[PDB]
Amino acid sequence: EYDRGVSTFSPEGRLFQVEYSLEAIKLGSTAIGIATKEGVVLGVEKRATSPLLESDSIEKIVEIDRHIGCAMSGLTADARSMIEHARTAAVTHNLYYDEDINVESLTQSVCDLALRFGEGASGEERLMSRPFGVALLIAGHDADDGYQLFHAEPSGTFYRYNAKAIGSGSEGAQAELLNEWHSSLTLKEAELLVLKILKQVMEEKLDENNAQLSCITKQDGFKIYDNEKTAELIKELKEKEAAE
Template sequence: MTSRPIRTCRSRATMCLLEKCVLLACVRGSHVRGAHRELCSPAAADPKSTLKKRRSPPPVFASLSLSHRILEMFLTRTEYYRGVNTFSPEGRLFQVEYAIEAIKLGSTAIGLRTNEGVVLAVEKRVTSPLLEPSSVEKIMEIDEHIGCAMSGLIADARTLVEYARNHRFSYGEPMTVESTTQALCDLALRFGEGDEESMSQPFGVSLLIAGHDENGPSLYYTDPSGTFWQCSAKAIGSGSEGADSSLQEQYNKDLTLQEAETIALSISKQVMEEKVTPNNLDIARVAPTYHLYTPTEVEAVIARL
């Protein structure tokens, strides 16, 4: 059984350090101002009066209140942008919105549901000729009847996938596709500040979850806000807008599995910046079990275009 990593929350430590710096600056400023007043006052000529003044405690309490006021002014301006649990006056969680925007920079992933099963196709960005293409995983198996394609931060996706796999390891029984999706979205909402069991920020990844259970084939889409939808066809990632438009034109519920493969590949070819090859594209199907295509099988699908 795998354990999910716990992210350290650095916001509390940052705020403590900021408060100490502001307090130190204020205390030092109070000492300088106090010394200046002592030297410039008429009583400075009297040694006894000066000695009495120097023995009096510095105005630390005034500095404390001033530091809190400065800190409050700083927080009021930026807490909506940095905090993961603080709503802005407009009712927005900016950290969740930033995570959703990060998905638009990821690889394009496409999913289509048919009566026979579900097809997934994902672009693989091989950034260097020294990089082994097989090491770039954009489609992962959750169970023998469930697979998922991802766009965004792969490390976050691995955390979600490992969490979903734990049910089979713990109970020895399969989960339905909807229950698996619900469990992942519940985990995606466990972010906060000051709690060691919570994530320090939202997951920066979006998933297309394909599965086949007693209810038949199904396709679900999740985002960093913990929301999920059931879809007939969906695209995520950097080319999602153009891919979704093409899916609306080409998709119909009577598609065969082979036709869905061809549509997914042709749309991927339209939105990808490079030529489609088995090295930069992953294809998988769940019909009714999960199967990731080999490079030879991907080459055969490309040949049908």
């Protein structure tokens, strides 16, 4: 009716295929991202579907560059296209200017790519017939604004957040975040915060074969926490939930 077109409206007034894409982020497993000014931590629910699954070479944590991290949630086939372009973008800036790209600037570049649907609209080279179905939580560190966390839509729009969760447990996670986030959370107090909120939206047991942690720090760069360290922290959650 109002989606047979390749870019069509909508008696509401906003594009229809894009709207479906935003309600297809929810299908993906929860991706949480908590930003403090002491670093940004990204946690993800990997999902284990079988014990025959090898899940420690599967993650939704991806390095864009040393000083920019990303967590992806939604349909992750779509994010394969976007992550390649992002990596190229970051490299281009250091080729052209010998300089580290801003977190904001990188997000904006990936937003430009996201609008490429239609097959008769605008002047640009169209190479999609439908919008991407994946939303990103681009974290990073630039020296001009410190630590930054952006939430990038498949729309091609972006908001800077201090904490945003997307995916299945988006609503129940974010309910907690509005009250529980403040600026005196340190990196390690953020780190245990991720695991507490992730436990509520975890549809399995909370463990390190269905959860993966990652930080982005200026000092050590983009480091993905090994499963040994991830497991350790998870056991330290269950102790502090028995300290209540």
